[PDB]
Design a protein around this ligand. Structure first.
Ligand SMILES: CC[C@@H](NCc1c(COP(=O)(O)O)cnc(C)c1O)C(=O)O
Ligand SMILES: CC[C@@H](NCc1c(COP(=O)(O)O)cnc(C)c1O)C(=O)O
Lengths: 396, 396
């Protein structure tokens, strides 16, 4: 039955490193991998998680199954991280959280939930946006419609085009936001824009679905939640898919959550039972390790403090690499102006390179980057910044 | 949009312990939880895995993402465990293995694969069979059709009814087997029966889908693979979903594999790329921990030896509990005869209790069991065997 199967095409991101891991070229920079790398170009395991793993190794007495929703302390903590402490929806018990295999499994879980328990047919993802969004939503049978976003000229957020594009979206439609550090533009709404987006959202009656994966990478854990908090303040219902892959360096342990906010405790339980149903049919229960490492780190003040410092070292390092990048380019020599780069949050930014330039780079200079011209700033070290900018300026 | 959601009904297995965990009753036995428990009624973490976790804790230098298919050594090892060493399909390179979140995620992965890349509409699950099978297959959009299995009278495998029921299944249909320790009957085909089932399978042209979750619990790692090996010898293509949850006590780490056997290396790669595609849309990459604990334990001879001994202590303990159960019942006093219990493999067996008896037990005697009258033998200790059999005999 497999003799006629069509070979799948390469993923726009993976198929980059998978090839990178073949181009011997000495000096081969890589800016694809939306994974963080320190000043050494290494993706270490945070000390806090390292300490948490020792504690676990010593205390765990069993591997017996977790509830379908995962670890209680986990859900509770992510709740407070997202909605805040003393947040109404917390105190009222309007939310329910489920531990899932990473932020993607939270998406797939939201999708399947929606897809079989509601009258949702379309999802509105921005343009551009993390590629896998569409694939995930489509696999559930849902339709994906793009709302404009990037001002290719001024290198900014085109609020006008956005709203104008969003208006066509009907009520009862899911509009997907990026809590912070927009993949791949790095441009995020201001609180003001967010605050209006939350108003026009209740009116038109969309169903928010925040994809929060880089909390703490723009301005800090709390500041980064302003948006999700603005909507949460206004809506009776919402969904949020968060991931601990980055802000915790837990990439391969697949740890994230899917938080259902409904209008009242009574219904949030009903809606959640069906969510659990989706999960039970997908993977049964989530993986305990990475989640346990997160519950303990967050419920322990010594460990949380160390962690909370590591996150900011990461955050601060990427922000040093942004301006170093701007300055270095402006130094090598030529007409240009990448000052906008300094205004974008997170690990990514839109280089503003043509698909062609990008190939001249990753083939004549081995400097790898994603076709869209997206470059992972958190993969830049002070030692590769020179040949890098040389390559770039050379292809301008 | 959630105000009219229908509250999901309770799962036939979970909703048992979830209530058990509320019935204070001193002496409250529990036979639901298809999870293993030692002579103390504890589900410990094996020593081998404990040692493997220390090694990991010391050596792991990164948490960076795994390939979509998981850990190479993992896939390679599970391959040799399943098909054998020097097995043609291994040497020929006709198989591809992907690490998934437990045996269930392997199922869901096979399903989604089939569901979108082939002309498969129906799956044939036995009667009875692990409940979640249907839910999983249905969530993918596939149809589930039951083929007879249990001889409620003689307490045996009704080969006749089976074949007779299977014949209606068309070609290009997926027939799902249980490699060993049939949930919930404990009755498994003989090699002879298996060997014929493999012949009639090629003719009618079904597409095998073995659900292997209790390897090593019937007669030992190798003996337990006779079946999957019989089919593998005969078919050009097959799929197998294995789980390390039991034979490794890794329940909550979600570690299993989905092995695609095709007719040749060239196509198995094509078929696999699409499988990876399904995964990428579901959870992206698998959880590394539990899988790492398994690769190292199996690739290290000292650790494998310790583990390989632990598995047999478990296997041997359940087999002591079967005959102790038979003898004790026959001792308390009454017309009956549970000798068939001694002939069933694995942790389960069909008590042969009416839904009524089962309620008299778990409500007048607090002795919990699944409505079907399925009882987890690996939850019986020499210390609870007395009141247990008293309860049972009392409801005969
Ligand atoms: C998978 C890595 C990808 N970023 C991961 C990612 C996720 C979820 O990933 P997780 O499952 O690993 O939590 C969700 N949402 C966005 C916008 C992401 O960029 C990238 O290359 O940007
Ligand atoms: C989930 C526990 C269940 N047995 C688990 C189980 C699985 C996969 O479970 P896993 O994902 O945890 O690997 C697959 N197949 C069978 C026949 C099972 O009994 C039981 O109560 O029998």
């Amino acid at each position: 039955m497999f003799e006629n199967i069509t070979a799948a095409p390469a993923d726009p991101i993976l198929g980059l490193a998978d090839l990178f891991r073949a181009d011997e070229r000495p000096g081969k920079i890589n800016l694809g991998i939306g994974v963080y790398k320190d000043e050494t170009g290494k993706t270490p395991v945070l000390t806090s998680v390292k300490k948490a793993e020792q504690y676990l190794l010593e205390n765990e007495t069993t591997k017996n199954y977790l509830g379908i929703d995962g670890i209680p302390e986990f859900g509770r903590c992510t709740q407070e991280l997202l909605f805040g402490k003393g947040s109404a929806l917390i105190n009222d018990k309007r939310a329910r959280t489920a531990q899932t295999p990473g932020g993607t499994g939270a998406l797939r879980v939201a999708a399947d939930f929606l897809a079989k328990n509601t009258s949702v047919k379309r999802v509105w993802v921005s343009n551009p946006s993390w590629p896998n969004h569409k694939s995930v939503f489509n696999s559930a049978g849902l339709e994906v419609r793009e709302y404009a976003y990037y001002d290719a000229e001024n290198h900014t957020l085109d609020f006008d085009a956005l709203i104008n594009s969003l208006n066509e979206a009907q009520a009862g439609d899911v509009v997907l936001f990026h809590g912070c550090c927009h993949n791949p533009t790095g441009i995020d709404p201001t609180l003001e824009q967010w605050q209006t987006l939350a108003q026009l959202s209740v009116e038109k009656g969309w169903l928010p679905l925040f994809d929060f994966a880089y909390q703490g990478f723009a301005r800090g854990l709390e500041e980064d939640a302003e948006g999700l908090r603005a909507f949460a303040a206004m809506h009776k219902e919402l969904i949020v898919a968060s991931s601990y892959s980055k802000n915790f360096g837990l990439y391969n342990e697949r740890v994230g959550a899917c938080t259902l906010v409904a209008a009242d405790s009574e219904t949030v339980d009903r809606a959640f039972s069906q969510m659990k149903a989706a999960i039970r049919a997908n993977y049964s229960n989530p993986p305990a390790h990475g989640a346990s490492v997160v519950a303990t780190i967050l419920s322990n003040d010594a460990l949380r403090a160390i962690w909370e410092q590591e996150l900011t070292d990461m955050r601060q390092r990427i922000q040093r690499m942004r301006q170093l990048f701007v300055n270095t380019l402006q130094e090598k020599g030529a007409n240009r102006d990448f000052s906008f780069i300094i205004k974008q949050n997170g690990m990514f930014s839109f280089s503003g390179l043509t698909k062609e330039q990008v190939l001249r780079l990753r083939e004549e200079f081995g400097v790898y980057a994603v076709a869209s011209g997206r470059v992972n700033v958190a993969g830049m070290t002070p030692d590769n910044m020179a040949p890098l900018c040389e390559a770039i300026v050379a292809v301008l």
